[PDB]
From a paper:
[name] exhibited a T50 value of 96 °C, representing a substantial increase of 40.9 °C compared to APPAmut4. Notably, the variant [name] exhibited a remarkable enhancement in thermostability without significant alterations in both Km and kcat values compared to those of APPAmut4, suggesting an unaltered catalytic efficiency. Through analysis of the mutation sites in the crystal structure, it was observed that the introduction of 10 cysteines effectively facilitated the formation of additional five pairs of disulfide bonds within the crystal structure of [name] (C147/C268, C271/C413, C353/C401, C101/C116, and C57/C103), each exhibiting distinct electron density. These covalent disulfide bonds establish crucial connections between diverse secondary structures such as α-helix and its surrounding α-helix, β-sheet, or loops, thereby ensuring robust structural stability of [name]. The substitution of Arg382 with Ile382 resulted in a reduction in the average B-factor value at this location (22.1 A2 versus 17.4 A2), leading to the stabilization of the β-sheet structure.
The [name] APPA derived from [name] exhibits exceptional overall properties, including a high specific activity (3960 U/mg), excellent pH stability within the range of pH 2.5 to 10.0, and resistance to pepsin and trypsin digestion at 37 °C for 2 h, making it highly suitable for application in the feed industry. However, the issue of heat resistance has emerged as a critical bottleneck hindering the industrial application of [name] due to the technical requirement of instantaneous high temperatures during feed pelletizing processes. The active site within the two domains typically consists of two conserved motifs: RHGXRXP in the N-terminal and HD in the C-terminal, with His and Asp serving as catalytic residues.
Author numbering: 8 to 418
The structure:
Amino acid sequence: PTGYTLERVVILSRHGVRSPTKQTQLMNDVTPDTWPQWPVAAGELTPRGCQLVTLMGRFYGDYFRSQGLLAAGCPTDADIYAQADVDQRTRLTCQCFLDGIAPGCGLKCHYQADLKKVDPLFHPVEAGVCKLDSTQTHKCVEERLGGPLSELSKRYAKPFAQMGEILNFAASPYCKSLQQQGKTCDFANFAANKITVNKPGTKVSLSGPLALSSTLGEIFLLQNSQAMPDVAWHRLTGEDNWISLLSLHNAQFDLMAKTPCIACHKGTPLLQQILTALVLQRDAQGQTLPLSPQTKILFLGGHDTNIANIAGMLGLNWQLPQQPDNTPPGGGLVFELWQNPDNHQCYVAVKLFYQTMDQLRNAEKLDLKNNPAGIVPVAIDGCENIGDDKLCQCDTFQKKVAQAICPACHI
């Protein structure tokens, strides 16, 4: 392909750097050391996180103005529609994105007015739109894993041991308590890995060593991206060691968010919204936003779980050079609508836009030439994956979406 036009873009972005959501007794008990405190209330976007999102917004601006999808200077109000989930961290991310892609332009983000309820676009199962069946969910998650959860200790032996050494787990209150019971302090096996669906089927949670290690690995990465001086007690260094440690986090997201029998239910509203916005089908099912015919970019301010759900539904898999989290802070799953001017056949392309560990930690100015954001084209399962942009035919893509959705989970 050559000479195709970029007609429209949807950005499903993760929020930027946040403080940890929770500090449980388990998280304190698995290390003798003290977790460093954060300058912002639990779960909120940090000011540094906003600055990093704004830097990414400036890159998105340079990139799409180079393409021409965005004109020079301030975008209009019809050009960009930005919708955020109800969390503070997503709402502020959305505004910091606009401040970077349209600096001093006074663009405004939109969100569900009732902040005391989840937004079913981003959390339809939690919202009660559709329910998970526990029996089915245990069966199909084991099928995706390819064995019982007890195999995780062996599949991830080295990263689990690596995490225990970072935590100094052998000297921790939890280990001391295990030794009181005559058990050993094998961090990979400190407890069973367990999946629990709640009684109404509105929540599914993994707990145990993989879940904890995914949480703590993300915290270390957030510490690093926040530019904290002491990351993981200075016991985590080397890009090789970051990649292996965060493989626990990525594996947890694969199992609990990319498995289609969970992803289908949690991700159907977002997938319908992405699809209908990309082709600008303004009154199709799943198109809930007041999009103009002139819409050029739809920004969706969501979570790593949302990105992973969409990836599981579409069969997307990627690895990010110099970014060990597959769903990193402020990273965007970007959908492009490309059109052939000769016949007006359209195509869908998917890219993961992200900042590297150094780009985050050093708050680096991004630019098209010298220091661009990372951009990874992503192959789509069942798609034609044509050329450098891995293009999928519009009709092929719509067929895949139709097969992937759980239609009872629409809004």
